[PDB]
Structures are given as structure tokens and as C-alpha cells.
Amino acid sequence: GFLSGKRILVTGVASKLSIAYGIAQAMHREGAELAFTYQNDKLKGRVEEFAAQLGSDIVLQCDVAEDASIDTMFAELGKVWPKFDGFVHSISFAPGDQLDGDYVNAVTREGFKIAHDISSYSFVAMAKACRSMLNPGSALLTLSYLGAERAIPNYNVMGLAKASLEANVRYMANAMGPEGVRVNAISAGPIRTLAASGIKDFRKMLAHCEAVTPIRRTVTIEDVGNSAAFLCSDLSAGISGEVVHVDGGFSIAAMNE
Template sequence: MSPSHLPLAGKRGLIVGIANEHSIAYGCAKIMREQGAEVAITYLNEKAEKFVRPLAEGLAAPLILPLDVQADGQLEQVFAAIEETWGQIDFVVHSIAFCPMDDLHGRVTDCSRDGFLQAMRVSCYSFIEMARLAEPLMKNGGALITMSYHGADKVVENYNIMGPVKAALESTTRYMAHELGPKGIRVHTISPGPLKTRAASGIAHFDQLIDDAIARAPQNRLVDIEDVGNTCAFLASDAARALTGEVTYVDGGFNIMA
């Protein structure tokens, strides 16, 4: 297939959340680039830059920018750079989440106020902020895509406070899909099965969760970051123009099991 006929040819978007080559965000960036998109990439801080920059350069990213969503003004600077460079944007991939370890490993009942607010700030509210900044740049419509997990809908042992946080994120997806739909902006949540990423390593007894997913999923396998990337690329493409507001599971069917 020639470059001009690739599914995402001519589309440009921001991908947030790459930490290393095992990140879900990197799987999305890699597949979307292969399908013809230009991608702007962010890194959390100077420590992360040395891991992210080579990956971004390998994707020929024209913009490689620092972004800590908790730092005042940084998100606005990212979108200002996008507007200056491209003038508009077609998609945003939000693949970030955080919770202080003490709160992540404790009961929901015992979660601290500060821990809950920080988890919501990074994992959910930042998606709202990105949508608000992307909206005026999505002049021809577009797609906003975020990442959740089955623990948002069902109780998953040791997922703890991130379950309610991701549930809020999924609900936010539906409300923003309703609000932005008239402008041709679609909003999606992807819910991957467990993946061996750096972020997931913070979940207690994660290996047990992996084993359970393999045993119970109809496909009896783990998904990988390319599986998620393929779904993300589809949702950002014109082929998905009639889809919005949904949670799309990429988990080998695990979510359908009792």
C-alpha cells in the first residue's frame, strides 16, 4: 500500500505516556506511524527523556516535548507547539495514570484524600484538559483516546483505588463524546488486558493477575502493545467515524467471562 493510501495518511496527533519500548503508548505510536500518521511525543521529565527521545526519533516525531500534567502550564505549552507546527490536530492518545504507592496498595476505604485527588488529577482530569485544548485544533473533527482497565467495571483484586479512578475516566469518555460529537470529535476508551508495563508493575501480585488472564480469557493468551496499537489506530481512522463514547476491550475476551 502506498503511503498516500495508508489508513492514517495525512493525520497528525499527540501521544502521551511513553516511558519505554514496553509502554502501551509506544505500541500505539508505532502502529499509528506505520499506518501513515505523524506523531508528536511527550516525555515526563529529564530522567525519562533519555529513554523516550530515541524512540520518538525512531518514529520521526517532529515534536518531542516535556509534559508533566501536574506542572502548571506544561500542557498548554505542548498544545501551543502543536498549533505553531501543524495548525491543527486529528487525534490525541492519553495513556497516563498515577497513584501514590501507599494508596494503590491499600484498601479503597483507607485511601488518603491527597492520594485520591492526585490519582484523579493525573489519570482522569488530565484527559479532560487535553480534550479542552485539542477541541479548537480539531478543525475537521478528530479522535480523543484514553486507556482504562477491566477493574473499572468489576472488582479486580489489588487494583484498589484505581478501579474507581478508571470508572470516572470511562464515564468522562461518555460525557465528552456527547458534548463534542456535534463537532465531529469522537471520544474513546480502550481497555486492554493486563500487560507487562512499568506502570503495571506497581500493582501488588501482578503476576497472579497475568496468570489468571491467560487461564480465563477465551483466547488463552495475553494481548500485547501492538494489539492495543492496532485498535487505537482503527479508532483514530475514518473507518471508525460512526463510533464514539464506547469502551473497547482488547483483552482476548477476558471481560466476557464470569
């Protein structure tokens, strides 16, 4: 596999429907050694379950809200992987009330802070903590969404956090490049997952992003997975600070009936 010999930390796996699960699955297939993290005691068991299916016995607890949680996690990974080759950041959050109805009315100072902290700061918080642990040629990857570029209904505050995320990607990519680290993000299209139920009326939202989509179908965790495996391999050595769209061309088209 074009990923053999690589050691990648995968986060955000919560179910077989999780985009991260599709990513881990595709990387394992390409020969990568994986390491997983779970947010809390509620998810641990299931993460270990999937971790086992992928020949991995490295399951660490990690809540990006707590800097100390992040330092303890990496201080632990360091006991088996003194050095690894990057990680996948697949984490987002915002209280439900932030994603419903008018944006100006729903958004609050508190909701704003949580969405940006958990969805955009955590990405660099993790890079800072494991900086010296990364081998040259390592790659860091995160997941964004079209709402960062266009204003989408009900997505509201997340759109601003995602915009911030993509900017984070470019600043991280620029600062860490001389060390041999690349940073990119995949801006995936609508995919029915667990949290995907958060946005109001998402069932009919994915139906819209099908007929108007160039390839005439929404993407799967497999599609994002293959692209994520590519962006974290040595085959994409010339790509850094890029936001590649994996939405079947949905964004590059307009008024498709």
C-alpha cells in the first residue's frame, strides 16, 4: 500500500457511519499503522472494537476542549510511537440551538466561542502538542464544509468556524512546512452520519445535493477515505495548505435545474 510504514493518529470515530471510520478503513487498507482516540467513556468500548478490526491496540482518551487532556494523550502515544507521521482531525461541535432558524437570532457569544474553540482551535492545539514528535514528511488533515465559503441555512455559526478552520490550515501549513510537515483539509459534501442529524431538515438537504450534483450522487465515507489516504501519503508531497473539494463537483456548478 502507498501508506505502508506510516503511523497515523485517527480521531473522531464514533460509529461505522463516521467519516473518520471511512478514513481509518481506507488507510489501513493501504498499509498504515493506526492509533485511535475516543472523546469519553461512552465511546471507548466502540472505539476499541473498531481499533481491533484494524489491527490496532492503541486507544487513547482525548477531549480537545481540555489542553491537559491533549497533553496527556500525546504523552501516552509517546510510549509506543516516539514519532509518528501526522494525524487526522475529524472533530466539530456547537450546541444544537446554534444550528436552527435565523443565523443572527440563533448565534450567541457562548455558542460562537464553543464552535470556534472545538471546531477550529483544536486542530492547531494538537499540532502544537505533538510538534516535535512528527517525522519529516508527516501530514496533518482536517475536514471542512462548503458552509465556510458560502452562507448555508441552519449551518450558521459552524460556517464561520469552518472558515476559520481553513485559514488555520493555511497558517499551519505555512509555519510547519520548513520542518517537513504538510497540512491540508478535505471539504466534503453532505454525508449522512450521526451528528449530521443536527442541522435542521438535513434529510431533504442531501436529496438536493444529488440531482444538482455533477456526478449525480453524493459522496460516501469511502470517497472521502480514499482522498484522505492520498493526502496523508508521500504521493501528495507537493500539496500543502490546500482545501480539496470532495463533493462530486457540487460547488463548481450553478443553477443545475
